[PDB]
Amino acid sequence: HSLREWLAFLEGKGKLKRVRKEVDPVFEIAALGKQADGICSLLFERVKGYAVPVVTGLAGDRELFAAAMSVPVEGMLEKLAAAVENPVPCRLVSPDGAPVKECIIRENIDLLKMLPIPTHHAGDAGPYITAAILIARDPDSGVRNVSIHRLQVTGPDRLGILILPRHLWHFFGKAERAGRPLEIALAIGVHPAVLLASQATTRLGVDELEIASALLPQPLELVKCETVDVEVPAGAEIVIEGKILPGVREVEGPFGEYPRYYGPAAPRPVVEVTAVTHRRQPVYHTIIPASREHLLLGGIAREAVLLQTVRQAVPTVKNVHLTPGGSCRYHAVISIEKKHEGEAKNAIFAAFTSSSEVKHVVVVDHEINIFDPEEVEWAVATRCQAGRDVFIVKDAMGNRLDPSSRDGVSDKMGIDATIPLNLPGERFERISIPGLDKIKLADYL
Amino acid sequence: HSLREWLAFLEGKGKLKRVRKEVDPVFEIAALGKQADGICSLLFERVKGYAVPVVTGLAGDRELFAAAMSVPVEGMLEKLAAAVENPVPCRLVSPDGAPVKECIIRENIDLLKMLPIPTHHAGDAGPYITAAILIARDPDSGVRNVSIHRLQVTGPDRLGILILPRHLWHFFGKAERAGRPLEIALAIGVHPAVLLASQATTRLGVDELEIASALLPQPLELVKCETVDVEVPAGAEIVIEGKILPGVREVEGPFGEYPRYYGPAAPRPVVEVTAVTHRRQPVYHTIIPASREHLLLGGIAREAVLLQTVRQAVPTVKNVHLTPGGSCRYHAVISIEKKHEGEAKNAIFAAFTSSSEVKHVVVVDHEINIFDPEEVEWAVATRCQAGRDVFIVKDAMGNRLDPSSRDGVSDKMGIDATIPLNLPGERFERISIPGLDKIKLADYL
Amino acid sequence: HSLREWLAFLEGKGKLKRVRKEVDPVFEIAALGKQADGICSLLFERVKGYAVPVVTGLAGDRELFAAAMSVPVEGMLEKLAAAVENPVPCRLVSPDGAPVKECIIRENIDLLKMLPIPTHHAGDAGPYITAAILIARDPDSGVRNVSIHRLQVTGPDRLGILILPRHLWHFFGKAERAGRPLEIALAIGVHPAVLLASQATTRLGVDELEIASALLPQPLELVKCETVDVEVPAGAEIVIEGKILPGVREVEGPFGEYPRYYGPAAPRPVVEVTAVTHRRQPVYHTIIPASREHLLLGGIAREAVLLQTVRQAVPTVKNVHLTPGGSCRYHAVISIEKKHEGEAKNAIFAAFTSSSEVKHVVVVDHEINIFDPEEVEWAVATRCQAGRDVFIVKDAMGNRLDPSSRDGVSDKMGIDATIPLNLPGERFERISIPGLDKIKLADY
Numbered sequence A, B: 001h002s003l004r005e006w007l008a009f010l011e012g013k014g015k016l017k018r019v020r021k022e023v024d025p026v027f028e029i030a031a032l033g034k035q036a037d038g039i040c041s042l043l044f045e046r047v048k049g050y051a052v053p054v055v056t057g058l059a060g061d062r063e064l065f066a067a068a069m070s071v072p073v074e075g076m077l078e079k080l081a082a083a084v085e086n087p088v089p090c091r092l093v094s095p096d097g098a099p100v101k102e103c104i105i106r107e108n109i110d111l112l113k114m115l116p117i118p119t120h121h122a123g124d125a126g127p128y129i130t131a132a133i134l135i136a137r138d139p140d141s142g143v144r145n146v147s148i149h150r151l152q153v154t155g156p157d158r159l160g161i162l163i164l165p166r167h168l169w170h171f172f173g174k175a176e177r178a179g180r181p182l183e184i185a186l187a188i189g190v191h192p193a194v195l196l197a198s199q200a201t202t203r204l205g206v207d208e209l210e211i212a213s214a215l216l217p218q219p220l221e222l223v224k225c226e227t228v229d230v231e232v233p234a235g236a237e238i239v240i241e242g243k244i245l246p247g248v249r250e251v252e253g254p255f256g257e258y259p260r261y262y263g264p265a266a267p268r269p270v271v272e273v274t275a276v277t278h279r280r281q282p283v284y285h286t287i288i289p290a291s292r293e294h295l296l297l298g299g300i301a302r303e304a305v306l307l308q309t310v311r312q313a314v315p316t317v318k319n320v321h322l323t324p325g326g327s328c329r330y331h332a333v334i335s336i337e338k339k340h341e342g343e344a345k346n347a348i349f350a351a352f353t354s355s356s357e358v359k360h361v362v363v364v365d366h367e368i369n370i371f372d373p374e375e376v377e378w379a380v381a382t383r384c385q386a387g388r389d390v391f392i393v394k395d396a397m398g399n400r401l402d403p404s405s406r407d408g409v410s411d412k413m414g415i416d417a418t419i420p421l422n423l424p425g426e427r428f429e430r431i432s433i434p435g436l437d438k439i440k441l442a443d444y445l
Numbered sequence C: 001h002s003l004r005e006w007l008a009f010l011e012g013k014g015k016l017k018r019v020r021k022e023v024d025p026v027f028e029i030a031a032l033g034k035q036a037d038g039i040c041s042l043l044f045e046r047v048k049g050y051a052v053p054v055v056t057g058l059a060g061d062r063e064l065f066a067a068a069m070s071v072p073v074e075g076m077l078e079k080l081a082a083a084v085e086n087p088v089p090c091r092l093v094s095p096d097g098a099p100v101k102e103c104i105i106r107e108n109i110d111l112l113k114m115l116p117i118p119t120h121h122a123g124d125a126g127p128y129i130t131a132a133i134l135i136a137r138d139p140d141s142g143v144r145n146v147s148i149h150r151l152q153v154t155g156p157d158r159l160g161i162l163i164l165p166r167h168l169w170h171f172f173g174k175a176e177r178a179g180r181p182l183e184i185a186l187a188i189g190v191h192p193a194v195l196l197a198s199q200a201t202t203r204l205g206v207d208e209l210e211i212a213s214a215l216l217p218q219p220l221e222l223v224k225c226e227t228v229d230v231e232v233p234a235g236a237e238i239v240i241e242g243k244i245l246p247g248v249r250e251v252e253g254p255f256g257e258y259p260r261y262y263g264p265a266a267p268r269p270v271v272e273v274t275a276v277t278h279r280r281q282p283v284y285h286t287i288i289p290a291s292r293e294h295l296l297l298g299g300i301a302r303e304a305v306l307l308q309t310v311r312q313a314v315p316t317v318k319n320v321h322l323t324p325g326g327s328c329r330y331h332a333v334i335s336i337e338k339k340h341e342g343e344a345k346n347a348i349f350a351a352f353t354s355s356s357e358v359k360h361v362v363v364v365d366h367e368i369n370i371f372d373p374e375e376v377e378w379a380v381a382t383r384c385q386a387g388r389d390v391f392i393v394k395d396a397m398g399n400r401l402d403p404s405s406r407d408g409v410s411d412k413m414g415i416d417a418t419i420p421l422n423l424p425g426e427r428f429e430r431i432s433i434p435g436l437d438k439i440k441l442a443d444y
């Protein structure tokens, strides 16, 4: 189970369409991809200036992510959590025969020359590599980490990188204050399960490639790199080996980001690329920022944690959802089977503790479909009284990229839209038409 | 421009579909209609027990209401407001030739026998007439009023009626405390402009039929009734002449209502029907409660007022929307071109004064599309800080049918999701792809 | 490492004192024990009406609980958490030689006759067994659970029991709706690590005796029961074998409980005792309700969870404390090394999600000693401004036994007493005396 096998699966399900007409990597790919967002993947067979085709939108809805993990939607968060608790080791494989080693390139590396790296949004500083998993080992303990980071193409052999302060930063800090570069490898064009695993949010020790291989049916085949002590998936379309230079900061950005605002420009670390390896006739994968693919990668991983955290406070939680309206981050909707009066407030506290990104939270009862915005809005309209069901907390920790925040400090709000417990059960009884699910309109026209 | 001409218009636009298979008026009509809600009108050609077909969903979206008023959507609220300020008189027409007089019936009236009156929701007390405009004159001044009222079929010649305390109640009170019945006429199967006008909310003096005839291209042709001193539209499919009996109260309801809850049963007025008149091969119109047709009839009329009221406080208001999530009543979204800091709070006050039904209000900037729930949710997620942008007012007047309310007393909430004025300008700049509207995906596959 | 070895350790440290004068089990034991609360254990050598002595206050402070787990205080919560994640199996041991089998008693069982079961607080319905771990197996899966439950003595061979809805209730429900009794065994007089493990709060599958044996240096020796399919610690002073009767409810309580208020009386399940086994010259252990022993048993277990939960929101949390003022439940004090402005509010949310019992929370900086009430009060006095550092949430889920609550619904409050980040930093510099730790008064 690799990217090729996944694109075939999409094509069999009618969720991949080919674009035969020529398209400019500057803006036209992003433009066309936005119109396909959530509906289908696009494979651009002819990208102006390049032999290599571009693909986008490998998974734009939660049903396809569930398929990528070989589960039904309803058990998706449970399986992701299970994969994080019981990682499965990978298999090292020989360089010869490994598809990613079909073409090695160690000299005169010019990334823009060889790869159709798109330029996505108007205010972007340049072309960006958006779908590369970044693999690295701790310089002390030797254990490896995977994360995804935007990479501005700033030269032939040179990338700017945004490293937020999580595990890659920890590694980089050790290398930097010992005067030494951090060796990395970037894999582009991998199976969605692998991308999803890069977003798993865990203890410091754990290898996300091992989380990925718990998600896939077979263990994940890896191969050693040419110029760095790092292993990469042998089935990847493209691999870029490099190192993050110590003490160097160059201006990266701005860049259109997940919340439909521009991430500000600033001096940030630099990758020097030491080799590129790829398949014969490789496919380039780009993730269009703010697309459903982008949002759900982080969203589903966050949701898996949110469910566990809410379960601690409210064991009878049924479901959780980080809405696309909130960039699958900021807004959370929890459904609970309420057993104790007050429980909804406690659920909201749990939602806030799941992540500092969570800003507004609404809680509804088990019967409300939280993946239908209209149904939750309905619940808020008719089951919330703001004087007793809303609370606001000022000046908590939020998110720097939310432009309403005061330098990452943010206010928070909770909305209890659950029915009061111990009342006449006919007061909030939602109207219904008997035999609705039994009858089907298509049978009558 | 009548109902027949409207159904033909729908059919020409692909928004009416026929259901040839037999359907039970008890539940199956409502069930099938719910699946068409917002997509298309359904004409049930074969209703079990009856020659007469049933139609539902004459207008399920705002574009079709705009078409029914012969305007583009963007000028719809302005035209409805204009029609209320400058009503146009109707034309009295001769009984012979008038289509609604083709079949008179003055004896052995059994409504359930002749008309396919559906039973809509599980907990409904019985079959209900849902789409009848009710016309009546003031016993003193003689000026007429139009409103729509649910009518429970409680006998062959007998209907229970809910009269909320507005203009029909005022008329009825005068008649009742003078010991006398109030003469009424019910017209079923009229043009959507006529229905929409019955919801216009005005000074006590004004005739909504005259509002309707300002909305239509020709003035509205009327004809005198057989047994009551009341005029009805000559083009109606069905007319039911009757009188509201003085001093009589019989149990009406329960009934599934606009907010997807059951209106409770109670003793209420009674209509005795004195005649029925109709076209040869009449079409019965039902409005399924809580359908888009139901919600938008009241919604658009309320929106027209909301716009004017918000304009008083904020002259640069761009748009207003009472959302279907709030039953086109409870939730309001206002867009303003903000000229003065603070303006959004003042807009919210105006939204509250438009109607006591308005409970939660969010204000966004001119560029946000307020008819897209995701775009307004996005604005709330990224441009609201609850500590300074939300306010809550306890124990105001709300709505009895909102079950969260304390006997019609309700809390209110306002959310200012506008950008602060006089700021750096690129902070809230929404990302974009240049040439997006110029490029079109269908041209590339 | 057993109870005997523990009492000797206490005596060697000067934290056990003997009471040679005669004492009434009705009220005088509780009264005297309350005055020793937190200072030392008391061994009552002469209890009016009985040969058997009573012991109380096996561990009244967190240093002694740490010692009972063979760790320094600073690593105590980490070790309890480690023991819950990696339970270690017990050793089944032969009945002969096992000290708890020295005296078996299967007939004419009269508990008040044989055991000096105290009556603790004024409004208590009677004598209560307060320190018995209760062991039981699931009727379906067969896996065992340990919890502590108050047991009213309502007859010679009969106890009333409060079962709150956790694991024992789950077991009991299965047995009850299949018409059958639930077999149990009560062990009294065990090592404090064992008691502490009975309070560990875990997944449904896990055996707390196995948590206890991870806490002890050697695995915990167990022995099969006489009349029930249940194992008990072979080293226990006293064991009471019995069964919880199906369909029977008898009035239990009232009883003075952890928050210094009376748990109300109500119809609850009944234990019929089928045997009693004990050592020759046994020691009876009682836990005085609301004592430090009582509070810290639950407190430390809750603290281990609270630390993990706060760590999720604030990875740089240093320490957590459920204060005795709040019955080691209701009030939480968190210390954090603050890295991001706002972090304290998020820590408070985590404190609330740890448990619905948590009502008021204060957060201070890493340098404040949160086990000194005066130092945290000082921090609140000088680093909190209520207008921006306090928040209140109305009508959340609380606790039924908190009498200020509206039928278990309770308001919550958070207090951020951390220094604001990015200020001068020398404004809040606390005064100090150089060479204070180097100098020692007893030397002068």
Ligand SMILES: Cc1cc2nc3c(=O)[nH]c(=O)nc-3n(C[C@H](O)[C@H](O)[C@H](O)COP(=O)(O)O)c2cc1C
Residues within 6 Å of the ligand: A130, A145, A146, A147, A148, A149, A150, A151, A162, A163, A164, A165, A166, A167, A168, A198, A199, A200, A201, A202, A287, A294, A297, A298
């Ligand atoms: C499309 C995409 C782009 C991302 N870009 C960045 C980025 O540029 N910088 C960054 O710090 N994190 C970025 N992330 C987030 C990390 O990939 C993610 O938080 C990851 O779990 C961090 O791993 P760690 O906890 O092992 O460090 C991105 C995530 C996705 C899905």
Ligand SMILES: Cc1cc2nc3c(=O)[nH]c(=O)nc-3n(C[C@H](O)[C@H](O)[C@H](O)COP(=O)(O)O)c2cc1C
Residues within 6 Å of the ligand: B130, B145, B146, B147, B148, B149, B150, B151, B162, B163, B164, B165, B166, B167, B168, B169, B198, B199, B200, B201, B202, B287, B294, B297, B298
């Ligand atoms: C489908 C539908 C059903 C309605 N049913 C009722 C009803 O049963 N009772 C009632 O008082 N108003 C009902 N109304 C509202 C009145 O028709 C409306 O408020 C009208 O504007 C009142 O007229 P007036 O202002 O001239 O009194 C309904 C409206 C619609 C769109």
Ligand SMILES: Cc1cc2nc3c(=O)[nH]c(=O)nc-3n(C[C@H](O)[C@H](O)[C@H](O)COP(=O)(O)O)c2cc1C
Residues within 6 Å of the ligand: C130, C145, C146, C147, C148, C149, C150, C151, C162, C163, C164, C165, C166, C167, C168, C169, C198, C199, C200, C201, C202, C287, C294, C297, C298
């Ligand atoms: C002194 C003491 C007395 C207790 N008394 C009771 C009680 O009477 N009823 C009860 O349900 N729990 C009581 N508990 C609580 C249980 O021992 C504790 O909640 C246990 O962890 C439940 O475990 P479980 O999750 O395996 O059921 C007491 C705890 C202590 C320290």
Ligand SMILES: [Ca+2]
Residues within 6 Å of the ligand: A383, A384, A385, A389, A416, A417, A418, A419, A420
């Ligand atoms: Ca509520």
Ligand SMILES: [Ca+2]
Residues within 6 Å of the ligand: B383, B384, B385, B389, B416, B417, B418, B419, B420
């Ligand atoms: Ca704002």
Ligand SMILES: [Ca+2]
Residues within 6 Å of the ligand: C383, C384, C385, C389, C416, C417, C418, C419, C420
């Ligand atoms: Ca402070």
Ligand SMILES: [K+]
Residues within 6 Å of the ligand: A146, A147, A197, A198, A199, A200, A201, A208
């Ligand atoms: K990761």
Ligand SMILES: [K+]
Residues within 6 Å of the ligand: B146, B147, B197, B198, B199, B200, B201, B208
């Ligand atoms: K009207």
Ligand SMILES: [K+]
Residues within 6 Å of the ligand: C146, C147, C197, C198, C199, C200, C201, C208
């Ligand atoms: K337990």
Ligand SMILES: [Mn+2]
Residues within 6 Å of the ligand: A145, A146, A167, A200, A202, A206, A208
């Ligand atoms: Mn990681």
Ligand SMILES: [Mn+2]
Residues within 6 Å of the ligand: B145, B146, B167, B200, B202, B203, B206, B208
């Ligand atoms: Mn009127």
Ligand SMILES: [Mn+2]
Residues within 6 Å of the ligand: C145, C146, C167, C202, C206, C208
């Ligand atoms: Mn347990």
